[PDB]
Structure formats: structure tokens, C-alpha cells
Amino acid sequence: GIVEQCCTSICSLYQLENYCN
Amino acid sequence: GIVEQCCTSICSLYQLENYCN
Amino acid sequence: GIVEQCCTSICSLYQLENYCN
Amino acid sequence: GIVEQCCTSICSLYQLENYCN
Amino acid sequence: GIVEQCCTSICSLYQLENYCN
Amino acid sequence: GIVEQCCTSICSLYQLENYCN
Amino acid sequence: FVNQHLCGSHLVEALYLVCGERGFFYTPKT
Amino acid sequence: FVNQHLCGSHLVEALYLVCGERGFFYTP
Amino acid sequence: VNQHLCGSHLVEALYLVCGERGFFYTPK
Amino acid sequence: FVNQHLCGSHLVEALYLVCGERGFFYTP
Amino acid sequence: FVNQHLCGSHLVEALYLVCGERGFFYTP
Amino acid sequence: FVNQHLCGSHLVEALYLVCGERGFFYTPK
Ligand SMILES: [Cl-]
Ligand SMILES: [Cl-]
Ligand code: NA
Ligand code: NA
Ligand code: NA
Ligand code: NA
Ligand code: NA
Ligand code: NA
Ligand SMILES: [Zn+2]
Ligand SMILES: [Zn+2]
Known part of the structure; x- marks a missing residue:
């Protein structure tokens, strides 16, 4: 999801x- | 400038x- | 909806x- | 206080x- | 208050x- | 720069x- | 209209906080 | 997870701008 | 609504200006 | 700590929304 | 009303996102 | 975690407030 994708990098x-x- | 261009439309x-x- | 309802009051x-x- | 309570969870x-x- | 003081100017x-x- | 100076302290x-x- | 654009930014922040794990849909369309 | 909570606030702001009239769904 | 949107920015500004002093926000 | 600093900025925006006409002291 | 100031706050946030590593200049 | 990016967003808000009519350049790199 967006959190996994966009909060990590x-x-x-x-x-x-x-x-x- | 940006304020004139972007603060109404x-x-x-x-x-x-x-x-x- | 939300804009008409919540941006006018x-x-x-x-x-x-x-x-x- | 609020920081101790709400910045850790x-x-x-x-x-x-x-x-x- | 702050709204009257700081939201007009x-x-x-x-x-x-x-x-x- | 500003990030190095201001993002930990x-x-x-x-x-x-x-x-x- | 920029006034609506600015209002909407605050609305989505509010929905983010209010809705919690429910989530929300938003469109500025309208 | 406060880190993700804070990140998510910025993500929804970013989606609001990027998506324009398409809009978006969000869930934490 | 204008005053409501303004107030959100006001508290963000007070947060930065006041630092460890903290602040008192009342729309009264 | 900047992480707490950033957290606090989001806290006061949330307090602004939740507290409404009551207002609030922010005393970190 | 402080509309221009409020608009500028959102413009800076938008430029920050859009411009990335390029950075930006802001003049009111 | 996107900490540096998030920090920068708050930094430019702070510069916007403190710099006033002077304006500012933001240059991460
Ligand atoms: Cl606004
Ligand atoms: Cl943050
Ligand atoms: Na206007
Ligand atoms: Na430190
Ligand atoms: Na107006
Ligand atoms: Na602000
Ligand atoms: Na005082
Ligand atoms: Na803003
Ligand atoms: Zn605003
Ligand atoms: Zn943040």
C-alpha cells in the first residue's frame, strides 16, 4: 500500500x- | 509572480x- | 457535497x- | 504530558x- | 482576541x- | 545546509x- | 477557485484525523 | 506507530494536490 | 470558514514562535 | 529532538480541530 | 483578511513537493 | 522512513513565517 511504499522511501x-x- | 498567478486560479x-x- | 457543506460554513x-x- | 502520551503512541x-x- | 487581531491583517x-x- | 543543521536538533x-x- | 482549493486541503487533513482506520474518499470536483 | 501517522498526514496532502479533480481514497 | 482556516495557520505559527514556552490559543 | 518537534506541530493542528471554540493551552 | 499569506503557505508546501531536489525560490 | 523529507516540509513552513517579505531560497542539495 501507499504507506508501505511512500513512508519508507x-x-x-x-x-x-x-x-x- | 507566483502569488498573482496562483492565488486566484x-x-x-x-x-x-x-x-x- | 463536503465542499458546498463545509467550505461555506x-x-x-x-x-x-x-x-x- | 501530551508529548509523552501522544508522540510515542x-x-x-x-x-x-x-x-x- | 487573536482571530480579530491576526486574521484581518x-x-x-x-x-x-x-x-x- | 539547512537540513543538516536543523533536522536532528x-x-x-x-x-x-x-x-x- | 483557489479559496476552495485551500479549504479542501484543510478538509482532507480533518478527515484523516476524524476517520482514523475507516479512511475516507475525497474529491475537489464540485 | 506515530511515524506513519505523521507521514500519512503529508501523504494525504500530497495526494490532494497531485490527484486534483480525480480525488483519492485513503486509509491508514 | 475564513477565520477557521486562518486559525489553523495561527496555531502552527504560535507553535514555532513560542517554542518551549508553549502558548494559549483561544478564539474568544 | 526534532522528531518531537515535528510531532508537536501535528498535535497542535489536531488540538485546534478537536477543541474548537474551547481553545487550548499547549504546554509541552 | 490574510488570504495572500495563507495562499503563500500552501504554495511553499506545493513547491517543496513539486520541486524536489531542485528546490525553489519563494517571493511573495 | 521519510524523516528528512518530512523535516524539510516543516523547515520551509518555518522559513515562510520568519523570512516575511524577504522570501527565501530552499536548496536541499
Ligand atoms: Cl487556508
Ligand atoms: Cl512530520
Ligand atoms: Na482572493
Ligand atoms: Na538533538
Ligand atoms: Na474569501
Ligand atoms: Na501554516
Ligand atoms: Na504572553
Ligand atoms: Na500550508
Ligand atoms: Zn490553509
Ligand atoms: Zn509533519
Whole structure:
């Protein structure tokens, strides 16, 4: 999930956009 | 400047990146 | 919904809870 | 105090409410 | 209060410091 | 830089002000 | 509208705190 | 897990900006 | 709502300005 | 400790939301 | 009302995210 | 854990407050 992915290492804008509805 | 451009109408990610170094 | 309701007047935490999953 | 209680474990809004005036 | 004092016009750091304990 | 100076020990306002234009 | 954009930022923070493990959906659409 | 709680606050702020009118779901 | 949004930023500013002194926030 | 400093910033935003018109003392 | 100041706070947060390692400049 | 990134977000908020009309550059690198 986003917490596991993006709280452990920094997510780029593109990686964050993966989690948009 | 960024305040004039972005404080009435919402700036997109692309527009915001105009103000990066 | 939430914008029309909670950006035009202050919503209580109870009102905000209605928008939870 | 609040830091000892709520920075070492997550405090809910109910626990935080105890600190209101 | 602070809202009347600091939400109509920006408060300086000195003005904000008034509310420190 | 500011991250090295201020991300383990808390920087004061005076210390932060050195990074202003 | 930037006013709504700014309000929404605060709304999602509020929902994050209020909803807890329930989570929430948000859209600024509207 | 306070670390994740704090991170999540920043994540939802980031998703709010990035997702725009698409919106997003979030759960901690 | 304007005053509500302002207050959120006010408390963040007081937190930084006041440091270990802490602060008193009342909208009264 | 900066970790506590950052935590506290989020605490006061949460207190602002929860306490509403009551307000609050923040006395770390 | 302090709308410009509030807008600026959110703009700086957005620039921080968007600009990443490039960094940014903020002038009100 | 994304601690340095989170710290920086709060640092730029602090600079925004303290620098006032002076503004600031933020340069992580
Ligand atoms: Cl705002
Ligand atoms: Cl944080
Ligand atoms: Na306006
Ligand atoms: Na005082
Ligand atoms: Na230290
Ligand atoms: Na307005
Ligand atoms: Na702020
Ligand atoms: Na902000
Ligand atoms: Zn705001
Ligand atoms: Zn944070």
C-alpha cells in the first residue's frame, strides 16, 4: 500500500499519482 | 509572480514547476 | 457535497464523520 | 504530558480532547 | 482576541509572541 | 545546509533566519 | 477557485484525523 | 506507530494536490 | 470558514514562535 | 529532538480541530 | 483578511513537493 | 522512513513565517 511504499522511501509525483482514484 | 498567478486560479503541477530552481 | 457543506460554513467533527468510509 | 502520551503512541481525537481548555 | 487581531491583517512575530505562555 | 543543521536538533528562529534572502 | 482549493486541503487533513482506520474518499470536483 | 501517522498526514496532502479533480481514497 | 482556516495557520505559527514556552490559543 | 518537534506541530493542528471554540493551552 | 499569506503557505508546501531536489525560490 | 523529507516540509513552513517579505531560497542539495 501507499504507506508501505511512500513512508519508507520518498515517492515521486509520478509514484504518488498511482494512488489517485 | 507566483502569488498573482496562483492565488486566484489554481495552478497545475506544471505551472507550479515554473517556480522551481 | 463536503465542499458546498463545509467550505461555506464550519463543519463539526460529527458532520465531517459523515464523509468517512 | 501530551508529548509523552501522544508522540510515542497515536492519540485519538478523544484522547486529544482531554487537553482542551 | 487573536482571530480579530491576526486574521484581518498579518501579525508580526512580536504580536504572535503575545500568546506565548 | 539547512537540513543538516536543523533536522536532528531544533533550530531557533534566529538560526532559521540566517537562511532568508 | 483557489479559496476552495485551500479549504479542501484543510478538509482532507480533518478527515484523516476524524476517520482514523475507516479512511475516507475525497474529491475537489464540485 | 506515530511515524506513519505523521507521514500519512503529508501523504494525504500530497495526494490532494497531485490527484486534483480525480480525488483519492485513503486509509491508514 | 475564513477565520477557521486562518486559525489553523495561527496555531502552527504560535507553535514555532513560542517554542518551549508553549502558548494559549483561544478564539474568544 | 526534532522528531518531537515535528510531532508537536501535528498535535497542535489536531488540538485546534478537536477543541474548537474551547481553545487550548499547549504546554509541552 | 490574510488570504495572500495563507495562499503563500500552501504554495511553499506545493513547491517543496513539486520541486524536489531542485528546490525553489519563494517571493511573495 | 521519510524523516528528512518530512523535516524539510516543516523547515520551509518555518522559513515562510520568519523570512516575511524577504522570501527565501530552499536548496536541499
Ligand atoms: Cl487556508
Ligand atoms: Cl512530520
Ligand atoms: Na482572493
Ligand atoms: Na504572553
Ligand atoms: Na538533538
Ligand atoms: Na474569501
Ligand atoms: Na501554516
Ligand atoms: Na500550508
Ligand atoms: Zn490553509
Ligand atoms: Zn509533519
